Design a protein around this ligand. Structure first.
Ligand SMILES: [Zn+2]
Ligand SMILES: [Zn+2]
Lengths: 233, 232
């Protein structure tokens, strides 16, 4: 019952985009997860043991041995709660509904939503070149995609506020379409005909990078929570 | 290479003093650690695989099966950096020196200081009766112990700021005297003739309690950082 957390969101804010975590190791830690890749070269998403790199060119590439990440989160997803949604529901209404059925706001959850969405809006981070800029700068020109009447899967994690800055507190969701070509990090969505599954997690295992970039990063950011809202909302 | 973290400091602040973590399980998770016991019935300290409950009655009781904790931290201590301190050094001077030799402020460390202390000041949290008050209120009358010219051991953890509220950011140290009777959570100390050892840790595993008390706790506390300074 664990979320395996690779590095911290505050390190990613500081422009630490080169990690040492080998994505070839994913099956040791989960069959489900999200994150990004070294150099912010695309969005990571996976479930049922199949992971993808989604880039702003509208392609999904399989995760391949040699791929590395500075920030990602995994779990072995088990469906502890299931809920059907058969009528239009906005993101706000959805968070309210899910929050109402969780056993506690103080635990970690993995969430999956499969089905038809009236709308999903995503962004996809793009490959950065050294010298790296802070992520609030990096995302300023991030590509934003609007999908209508789209079928696919949203996966992610629900993180309690005490963990903000390690992970993203609240709902952190990525999307991939039924065709497995397009999607990214989710900003907004409207559900139409979906099955929601939730997996409750009682442990969070944080793995720090053994890199000079992490060791030497200045992670004192008094405004980290606002910066996380800017980059992830 | 992990710190095993049982529950959060923010839940302790909120009066979640009854945990479900069985202290008999310690050997799975470390040979070294600090924290407290259910009901805040004493301070937990251990190293070299030997753990104690230090109570405000000036006794130390070995940990037994059936002992439970709402908050504690463990690791298998591996010396990575060892230094002799052979002259008087205040707490402030010590922290400055240790901070200057750490490879990164972004990692977790375990720390041990053994030897002769000119002074140590500790507190020992005391058993609370339900319904539980917040920790800032529960430590208002906390028992304080003062030690002078004492041999013993300080152990604990240095925690990066990004983990504050899960654990105590900065230095969190507990003490036990050579006689194994007395000590507690450290507020101040002056070294005299000591050896310091540090163990670097790259992983932190947070284990949450399976209790209604934790599940139902209101852990929104905008002022948690100040409250941790107050209690610790
Ligand atoms: Zn994301
Ligand atoms: Zn303490």
């Amino acid at each position: 019952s664990q979320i395996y957390q690779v590095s911290t969101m505050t390190s990613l804010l500081d422009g630490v985009y080169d990690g040492d975590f080998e994505l070839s190791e994913i099956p040791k830690y989960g069959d489900f997860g999200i994150g990004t890749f070294n150099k912010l070269d695309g969005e990571l998403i996976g479930f049922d043991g199949e992971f993808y790199r989604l880039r702003s060119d509208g392609t999904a590439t399989p995760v391949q041995n040699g791929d590395l990440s500075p920030f990602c989160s995994f779990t072995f997803f088990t469906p502890d709660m299931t809920h059907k949604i058969d009528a239009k529901m906005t993101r706000e209404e959805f968070e309210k509904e899910i929050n109402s059925i969780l056993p506690s706001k103080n635990l970690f959850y993995a969430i999956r939503i499969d089905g038809l969405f009236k709308k999903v809006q995503t962004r996809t981070v793009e490959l950065q070149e050294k010298p790296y800029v802070p992520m609030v700068e990096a995302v300023k020109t991030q590509p934003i995609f609007n999908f209508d009447n789209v079928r696919g899967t949203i996966v992610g994690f629900l993180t309690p506020a005490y963990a903000n800055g390690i992970a993203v507190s609240g709902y952190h969701l990525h999307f991939i379409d039924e065709g497995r070509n397009s999607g990214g990090h989710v900003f907004d969505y409207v559900l139409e005909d979906c099955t929601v599954t939730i997996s409750q997690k009682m442990n969070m295992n944080l793995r720090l990078p053994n890199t000079a970039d992490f060791f030497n990063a200045n992670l004192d950011n008094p405004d980290f929570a606002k910066d996380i809202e800017t980059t992830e909302g």
